[model samples]
Target chain A: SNRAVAVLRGETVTGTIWITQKSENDQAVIEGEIKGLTPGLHGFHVHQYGDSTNGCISAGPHFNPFGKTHGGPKSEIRHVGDLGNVEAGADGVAKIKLTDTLVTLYGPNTVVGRSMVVHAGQDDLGEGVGDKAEESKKTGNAGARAACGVIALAAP
Target chain B: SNRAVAVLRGETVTGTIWITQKSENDQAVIEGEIKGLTPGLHGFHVHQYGDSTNGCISAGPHFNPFGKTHGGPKSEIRHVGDLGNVEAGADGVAKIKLTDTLVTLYGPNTVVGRSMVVHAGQDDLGEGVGDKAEESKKTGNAGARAACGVIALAAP
Candidate 1:
């Protein structure tokens, strides 16, 4: 059915998401309508490997693109799974609509097999890239994959 | 630019996701992998709207498929965005994989524009879906979108 699809939508959430599936081409577009987030910034990213099979910790590493290592999404060479930080409002909600080129909606490149993680802290985004040869400056080492979920494509 | 796209193995995560691009008839397939996770059950789901311009309050409403009020992901015909609960391990991670055909990946019914959220709490699957549902149950009452991301299409 050569057509676009809406994988999932809406939740009894403090926030909401508007994810788009683009088939084998392009990364899935992630637009977050977040509420009750906080009045500041927080770390956000697609984890590397994990075992939601147990807990969020199982989902390891940030999305690293460059060969650098674990860092914030804003890092020059963070993991392909690294995502920068998300800003919230006084209302405790955030308005974040970003894109993930590495993330897919179908086949092998889907985030569904991955996890959406939030941190109680912030991913400095290179404020400390050179802090460590293995780690970066922007993305504060590892705060935590505070929350998680399986990205799922929805039906018509 | 025919280069091999790198794979950033994410950190071990708790919940898993299933992806499906809209251009591909919405056939969601699980992609990637997760590792460590918590040793208990976690809540999960997709959210509605991404123009969090107004904060989370703008995200507005759960994706209710059964035309019911806002509720949990597990509720029968709950909402298109409702993803119930995911289990984790003592390791603090939840290993999971899934295929979804509900949300749109691209095009008009795109999931890219939406959001995917992970709750700090649990989604009981809305064991309470009746008109007289419990207030706590009514919300599935997943506490908040502890984590959130806007779905976008992968880059070309």
Candidate 2:
């Protein structure tokens, strides 16, 4: 078993996200507390790079090792980075506890040495059709990247 | 006529600090909002580096360009970084507003590219003598860094 951690950084956003990958179970658990977010839904996903030079934008696009299109984690075909939305309560704090099967701590699909960005708006799960479908298919229309954090291996 | 901003980051603490150097008055106005800090006083100061690699420790000691010992802002010979403590109310939010002559946005004492660190404990202003004299002289016994942010030049 291996665990990784990300300390989200951004203007007015503070939080930590922990990802634990259990090789034996082929499962990964993600949880943490994100505060100062709007009291609503927000997009959360692993990005391609760990660089946050320009805040979250420098982290690049979603991690799509499978070359798949945008969709929810449960969808038949979706980007490897897709994990769906996290909801913040009226207090502007979001408690995250998610489980994903596609995330691995090792190998090509490993999320280690990457970055995660939280979007200011909710993810559409790529359900958009027609004219809006292009952008949605490309980014799930997750609006702006509000917060970002580099994922690193956690110490024992 | 210059300004700087620090985007504070931490697991449980977060905020922003804005510093504006009023060239005409030769005084810099420091103000910002910090949230999630424990209630009461927390030692706050500018560190030598803007790096937060090893948390705030990588930022090194206080920004004592004059090589002065630990002391409060008004001390005759104090570290330039010594801006003193910020008080957090019961709401765990601290609104800081301070003005100092020793700080500048330009010249040798410029703080435009330095880092600011908030300590978990209160600063004694180097007044600790006798039993606590040694530690006070070294760090004002301000305790661990609770949060940190890099000061950058803000756009006009």
Candidate 3:
């Protein structure tokens, strides 16, 4: 049977966000969208780790199941969580889509038990890098966690 | 100027998103792109409110600056926080782009003080009546706040 799905909603100082789940054997898909976003550009992505409290700040870096350093979502040996950002428009809309092999909606690598987080700022991406303005080569320059949720299958 | 620009990143989940301040008078621009996403369709959107302490649950409804019902990002007369979803492909990659108005970014209807979230399920776009999913249709099938970020200004 298809894995069950769970959906959640959140509101942050910057904007709102929507998250969805899609299981994958060949390639798993996770979707997201946002609106009422701040103008210009903000950083976005999954951290290496975290908890579902205080806006998911407890969740540490990305879920690096492979025990590798953080990198772009397209990187071969990137962190397990390493997700990118969602861009919104002046119309207050942000649409996003992702595909990965390391993530599983269920089973050992299942992200269900994990947590999703939205920050208060952009992720700069780089570690101990330049000024906050410099784009994070690794994390994208996103700031705080305005929102968060646990990844889980649909309730019975 | 080219509107505001912010960035967000995640390492554990293998995804990323960007929020752009799309309007000439707006503050920023957000663009999300993914490379190693799982396969299948995923939900997405921006949240209406924010509360960093409660994770996704803390963040309230979508950004309804006009106090109207729910709708999609592109819908007319919709909430300020009514973004659509992000769909992933078999290759596990997603690239989405959007903008935010100055009002939504700064004052009058600022998004900086709010939250952005993602879900582990799908948002049917607030379809049914009395159904939580249906009630949230205005935002889209984009589920919970699996991930999120705050809104800030670009570097000097």
Candidate 4:
């Protein structure tokens, strides 16, 4: 299947995300529905491992297979996992629809079997976008992990 | 498939585990081979989610889908995730084979899609085995997470 999903859950945060790709050459589309969050931007990313046994801390660093610096999903130079920030509304809900060329549901750079993380604060995108250029090169300086889940292949 | 597998990894630890059940009525057989440890007992368990986006800290608590308390794999009362401890030799290698009646690869109490964690210290097996009786019931007083991986269905 060319589709994958992740069910994000934290102390109070909960959400689900779906990623689909038509072909290897085509970009992937990400759709998400989230709830129980503060009204603001929350950094979102795909981590290196689906091993959350120790909670999000055991998931390891971002999925930077290409060894690139942290950047937004729209940035040309960014980690494969850098999907950037998600916004929550006044009602504490976030409805997201995104088209990303970096992370695909299938083929090279596929995020299947990895994991997704939603941060408690906004992502700086990169050193250039935020004040902490030196510290932001790796994690975008996203705050605590609010929610996370493994990326799994959708049933065919 | 009647088999599930988890590939555990840490800063230096690495291992693979295979769980197989012939039928729902039969017990499951767990086989594992691990490496890189301090040459002693290491706590082991299956976590609630296959989420490592933020690392093992995001994996949540031990897998107690039935809301049972913690105990060893052989204990009469124990969480489904409680598999007890793994022993590493002087060479830092551990090979394990265990038969358990609680966990199954298919049907009820299935562990697939969850995650496995190898801890840095020994699992008390429950409050009865360790000094920290109150704290042991939830985690067996296991130390930091050493390695972890998601349990996935084996290819047919």
lDDT of 3 by residue, A1-156 (tens): 223222223574333233333434455665656555665444455543223333455445566566775555666645677665556668756665666666654454555434565554655444536574244544455665555544433322
What is the lDDT for A109 in model 4?
A: 57
Best by DockQ: 4
**Model 3: lDDT to the true structure:** 0.49
lDDT of 3 by residue, B66-127 (tens): 77766655556466665555565777666666554423544445554344554445555555
Give each prediction's DockQ, rounded to 2 decimals: 0.04, 0.03, 0.02, 0.05
Candidate 4 structure quality by residue, lDDT tens digits, B69-127: 89999888899989999899999998889888878765545676677889989998895
State the local distance difference test value for candidate 2.
Answer: 0.80
lDDT of 1: 0.50
* Best of the two (2, 3) by DockQ: 2
Which candidate do you rate higher for TM-score, 3 or 4? 4
The interface root-mean-square deviations, each candidate in sequence, come to 11.6, 9.3, 12.4, 7.5
Q: Please give me the DockQ of candidate 4 compared with the native complex.
A: 0.05
| Cα RMSD for predicted model 4 | 12.7
Residue pairs clashing in model 2 are none
Model 2 CAPRI quality: incorrect
Steric clashes per prediction: 146, 0, 196, 20
State the TM-score of the second chain for every model. Answer: 0.63, 0.95, 0.68, 0.93
**Cα miss at A153, model 3 (Å)?**
30
